[PDB]
Amino acid sequence: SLSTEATAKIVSEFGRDANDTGSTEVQVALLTAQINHLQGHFAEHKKDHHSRRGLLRMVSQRRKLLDYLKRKDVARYTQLIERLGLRR
Amino acid sequence: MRHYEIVFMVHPDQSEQVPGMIERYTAAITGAEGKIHRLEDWGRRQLAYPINKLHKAHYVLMNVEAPQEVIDELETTFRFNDAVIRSMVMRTKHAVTEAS
Amino acid sequence: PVIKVRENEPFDVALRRFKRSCEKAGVLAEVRRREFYEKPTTERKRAKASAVKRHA
Amino acid sequence: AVVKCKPTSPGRRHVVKVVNPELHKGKPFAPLLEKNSKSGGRNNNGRITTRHIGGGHKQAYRIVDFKRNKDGIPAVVERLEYDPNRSANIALVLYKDGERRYILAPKGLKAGDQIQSGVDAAIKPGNTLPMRNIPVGSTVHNVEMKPGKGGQLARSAGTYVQIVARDGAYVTLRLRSGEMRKVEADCRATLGEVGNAEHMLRVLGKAGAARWRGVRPTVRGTAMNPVDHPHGGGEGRNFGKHPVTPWGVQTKGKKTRSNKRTDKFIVRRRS
Amino acid sequence: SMQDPIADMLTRIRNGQAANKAAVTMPSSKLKVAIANVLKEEGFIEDFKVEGDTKPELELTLKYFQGKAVVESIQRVSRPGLRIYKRKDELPKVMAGLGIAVVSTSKGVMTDRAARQAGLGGEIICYVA
Amino acid sequence: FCRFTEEGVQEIDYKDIATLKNYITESGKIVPSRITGTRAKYQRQLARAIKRARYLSLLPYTDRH
RNA sequence: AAGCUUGAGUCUCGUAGAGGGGGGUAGAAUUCCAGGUGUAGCGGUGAAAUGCGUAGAGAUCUGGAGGAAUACCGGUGGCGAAGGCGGCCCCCUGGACGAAGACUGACGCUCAGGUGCGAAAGCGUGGGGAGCAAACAGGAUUAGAUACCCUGGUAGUCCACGCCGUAAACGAUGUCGACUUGGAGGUUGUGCCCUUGAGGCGUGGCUUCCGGAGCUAACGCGUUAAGUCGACCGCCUGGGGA
Ligand SMILES: [Mg+2]
Ligand SMILES: [Mg+2]
Ligand SMILES: [Mg+2]
Ligand SMILES: [Mg+2]
Ligand SMILES: [Mg+2]
Ligand SMILES: [Mg+2]
Ligand SMILES: [Mg+2]
Ligand SMILES: [Mg+2]
Ligand SMILES: [Mg+2]
Ligand SMILES: [Mg+2]
Ligand SMILES: [Mg+2]
Ligand SMILES: [Mg+2]
Ligand SMILES: [Mg+2]
Ligand SMILES: [Mg+2]
Ligand SMILES: [Mg+2]
Numbered sequence: 001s002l003s004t005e006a007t008a009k010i011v012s013e014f015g016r017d018a019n020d021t022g023s024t025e026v027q028v029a030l031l032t033a034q035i036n037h038l039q040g041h042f043a044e045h046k047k048d049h050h051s052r053r054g055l056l057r058m059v060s061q062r063r064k065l066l067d068y069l070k071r072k073d074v075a076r077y078t079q080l081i082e083r084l085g086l087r088r
Numbered sequence: 089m090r091h092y093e094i095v096f097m098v099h100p101d102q103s104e105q106v107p108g109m110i111e112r113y114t115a116a117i118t119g120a121e122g123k124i125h126r127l128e129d130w131g132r133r134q135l136a137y138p139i140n141k142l143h144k145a146h147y148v149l150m151n152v153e154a155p156q157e158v159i160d161e162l163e164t165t166f167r168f169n170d171a172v173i174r175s176m177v178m179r180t181k182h183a184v185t186e187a188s
Numbered sequence: 189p190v191i192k193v194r195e196n197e198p199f200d201v202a203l204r205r206f207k208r209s210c211e212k213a214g215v216l217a218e219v220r221r222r223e224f225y226e227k228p229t230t231e232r233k234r235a236k237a238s239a240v241k242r243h244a
Numbered sequence: 245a246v247v248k249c250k251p252t253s254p255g256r257r258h259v260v261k262v263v264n265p266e267l268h269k270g271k272p273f274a275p276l277l278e279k280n281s282k283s284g285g286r287n288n289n290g291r292i293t294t295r296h297i298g299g300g301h302k303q304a305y306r307i308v309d310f311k312r313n314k315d316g317i318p319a320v321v322e323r324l325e326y327d328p329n330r331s332a333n334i335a336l337v338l339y340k341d342g343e344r345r346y347i348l349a350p351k352g353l354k355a356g357d358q359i360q361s362g363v364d365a366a367i368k369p370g371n372t373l374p375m376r377n378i379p380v381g382s383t384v385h386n387v388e389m390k391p392g393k394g395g396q397l398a399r400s401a402g403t404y405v406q407i408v409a410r411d412g413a414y415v416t417l418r419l420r421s422g423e424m425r426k427v428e429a430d431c432r433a434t435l436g437e438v439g440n441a442e443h444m445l446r447v448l449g450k451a452g453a454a455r456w457r458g459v460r461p462t463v464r465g466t467a468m469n470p471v472d473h474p475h476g477g478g479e480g481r482n483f484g485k486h487p488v489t490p491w492g493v494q495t496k497g498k499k500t501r502s503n504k505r506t507d508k509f510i511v512r513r514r515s
Numbered sequence: 516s517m518q519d520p521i522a523d524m525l526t527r528i529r530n531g532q533a534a535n536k537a538a539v540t541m542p543s544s545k546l547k548v549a550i551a552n553v554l555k556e557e558g559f560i561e562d563f564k565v566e567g568d569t570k571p572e573l574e575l576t577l578k579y580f581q582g583k584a585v586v587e588s589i590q591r592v593s594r595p596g597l598r599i600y601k602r603k604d605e606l607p608k609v610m611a612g613l614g615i616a617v618v619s620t621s622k623g624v625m626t627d628r629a630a631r632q633a634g635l636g637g638e639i640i641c642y643v644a
Numbered sequence: 645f646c647r648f649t650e651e652g653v654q655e656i657d658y659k660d661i662a663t664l665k666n667y668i669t670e671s672g673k674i675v676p677s678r679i680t681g682t683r684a685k686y687q688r689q690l691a692r693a694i695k696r697a698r699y700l701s702l703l704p705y706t707d708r709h
Numbered sequence: 710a711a712g713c714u715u716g717a718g719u720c721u722c723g724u725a726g727a728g729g730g731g732g733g734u735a736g737a738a739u740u741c742c743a744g745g746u747g748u749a750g751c752g753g754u755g756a757a758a759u760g761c762g763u764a765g766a767g768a769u770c771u772g773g774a775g776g777a778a779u780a781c782c783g784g785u786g787g788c789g790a791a792g793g794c795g796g797c798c799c800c801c802u803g804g805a806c807g808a809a810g811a812c813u814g815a816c817g818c819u820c821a822g823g824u825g826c827g828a829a830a831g832c833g834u835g836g837g838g839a840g841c842a843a844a845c846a847g848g849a850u851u852a853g854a855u856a857c858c859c860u861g862g863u864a865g866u867c868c869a870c871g872c873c874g875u876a877a878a879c880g881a882u883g884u885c886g887a888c889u890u891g892g893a894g895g896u897u898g899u900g901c902c903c904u905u906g907a908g909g910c911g912u913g914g915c916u917u918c919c920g921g922a923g924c925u926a927a928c929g930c931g932u933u934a935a936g937u938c939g940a941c942c943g944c945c946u947g948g949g950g951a
Contacts, residue, residue, distance in 0.1 A: 001802065001803085019811090020720095020812060021719075021720045021811060021812055021813090022719040022811075022812035023719080023812075023813060024719085024813055024816075025813095026719075026812095027719050037802095038801090038803090040801095041730090041802065042802095044730090045729095045801070046730090046870080047870090048731085048802075049729070049730080049825090049826060050728060050730080050790095050804080051728090051801090051804090052730095052826085053729095053790075053804085054802085054803035055802095055803075056824095056825075057790095057803090061718080061816095064816065064817095068815085068816045092799095095700065097700065097701075135701040136704035137701055137704050137705065137706070137709055137736085145701070147700075149659075156800075159800095160799095163733085164366075164367060167379065167733095168366070168367055174734080174735085175798095176696065176700060176798070177798060178798065178799080179798085189670065189707075190671075209670070209671075213669070213781095214781090218780070218781085221780095235784090239785050239918095240785085242785090243918065409774095424774090441835090442835095444834095445834070445835070511743095512774095516817050516886055516887095516940065517715095517817080517887070517939090518817095518818075518939055518940050518941090519887090519940080522887090522938060523887050523888070523938070523939070525938075526887070526938040527938090529888090529889090530888055530889045530936095531889085533889070533890095533937070534889055534890060536889090539888095541888090542715075569713075594940090596940065649907070650907050668781090671781090672781080673782090674782045674783095675782085676782070676783075676784080678783095684786065684787090687783090688782080691781090691783090692782095692797085694781095694782080695735090695782085695796070696797080696798090698736070698797090699734090699735055699796090701735095705735085705736050705737065706736085706737070709736095
């Protein structure tokens, strides 16, 4: 699924002064990474429907978070997408 | 690197040939720098029901902590080698070291 | 239920033992169940009924 | 994969294109290529021998290796190519010493796959080995009947032959038709299925395609005159005569196996 | 969602009245506190007290005079789905005066009667009897 | 009465033949948790162990074969 | 404009699970193929007949070949949004739930349209085909028997990638959030107190039955409401026609 060490690394990359662990941006990044990981699986296992629903839910959550960020402050939102490679 | 409990059955006449086989297996796991936890040979044991025609089988137990690749290789070997009849590959959790 | 006859033991007693073993197994009941195919739904309903009966 | 064409012309309507994008576009390998002269269903006596043959695009021969005599050497796939000679696809394989060979394409094979011919070869689709080393049960293509003779069984696209019995010198192979037959365990056989399963899903679409394929039109006996074919004649449509060849041999069940040689090796006929 | 707090509070109060609870505890607000104070003034309840810094909890002590609940009927007219705003002369008289209405009056939240006396209208929150 | 709970073990292993044979009948059929008095997860574990044994042909599927 | 944690989230350890998808494999049993032993019937029903069987069936032992489903465990057991999902084992993976804690700070709820999932049967190419079994055939039964019953038996049931998009898809109870005397339990965890022993203290999540307040047309539901409120939708407005 997603490694503890990997999560820690992500936190280090994104969260402010590493003390933060539940940052919105961080969460979004985590979601994205797992989607990317799972994309190959999805391509391979085309009929895996329950699993698909999970990631759909995750995707939705990510979208919501992005929306929240957007009107809160745009610049940071933009920055986050820049390093991520998220389209809009 | 994941914990792997493997117990396999060997042909009754191929009990003499398995020490070498055991050593080969050991080498294989050492190749990928995996861990060997325990090894217990129950020897020639009379089966509860006969498989094909053989009534007695050579039982071998082994606990591993290795990557997927070597496990896959082991499986392939098992599929190929008719001396080792069947194996029970299994996932385990934490350090399992003690037999009997 | 493979049953063997002991020395210093009557035939009737052996028969009785065999019967007991059979009862323990529930082979006849299983056969009855499998005699005709049961729809899963029907089986579930039966189970529910049994559960209801259990409550007294 | 399978491409259903948009029905622009009435010709292009039903055409189902079997498209493998993995295939190499351009020139086939030169020294492994030879002349394929079309005969048009005619023999030495110049007479039509087998009807409804001849025409279409000029074909070039591929010396596809079915013997596989280079034992103990790994072979890596250079590039997968098209073959007009057979329904199956062909792969050009680079050798570690330095050789190209045309081999029949396996199912689980792309560009850059390592295979091996010989006794010491391990389990992998594309590996060629004698049946006395093989585990019984698996699906096999490119199969020899006699030792060192050359692969003769399962060379059409997508085909495979399962192994059913092991009896020392002989091994029973359950064929694609279902006819179980005993083959000697010393003969070479290539593990896996043929690498064009989707070939059967192809629709030619039009008479033109058939003609290209090299197949002339087929006149129904019932249409022919009573001189030309047994099913001939009749005012309007008439048939009141049991279905036979152009030569008057029943063609609705009349079994014609009279080999009498290899019939000992045959275990059980097809269903 | 936790959409209406006032309504929730009212519901809690009703439940307490039904089940004969001595004290009802609930999440607190300033407007809520004001409402409670108003209720106390009117004479429906014994005493109210808010306690909590991060999570404020309003505790309400209920009366059961002569073996029966004092707050007989307590229902919102103004709602999150539909808000009711009333003019000064348009203000209701709940159960012919014998019973009251909680009104969001612009000069402090209070009784309908009080609002009338003042000369000011607004949003009619709840109907209390 | 559950013995496993009394013992205080993490996993019921297919190695111990003596414990597993007490929880199946002579013919080769598993005894319920309602008769033995076992916890449900533990029962499941036991069943799994039995299955494993059967696979390995340690304890039989059927006593006549 | 500026802030808060309880709502809603994410992180640390775990928790069990028929949660999926993909790949392997185990057993029994049926069918069939082959052979060995064997002889007069077998099979079926309420009773019979069709059937199968003097060619040797059924019976039965051995050897196989296969296709499918997983006895026993298995329990108003569990998990899933539902549809559903039960041999076992691996790979990929979703989610739930919890415990201490850490952090984000309303990120919440519902949802017209919209999108995805959606038992069965069916449909589509390709497979696969043991049983079962529409249709179909014969026998019965029958006043008749297009049925119920028997012997048989194709599609289908099984996979592969698609379509279909309906079920009494039913807890006949929309979804979420809040509150209100209880019990018997079961299930699934977990933290303290000397666990002085399976256990004790309580104390959180999950599901089943009885039932108080209440409610309703009653039946009944009943802290998982059909109760007391709020949000939001969806839908009804006599039956038939439809
Ligand atoms: Mg022709
Ligand atoms: Mg034609
Ligand atoms: Mg003519
Ligand atoms: Mg003629
Ligand atoms: Mg005519
Ligand atoms: Mg005629
Ligand atoms: Mg803040
Ligand atoms: Mg279906
Ligand atoms: Mg179909
Ligand atoms: Mg029938
Ligand atoms: Mg009939
Ligand atoms: Mg409907
Ligand atoms: Mg249902
Ligand atoms: Mg409905
Ligand atoms: Mg009740």
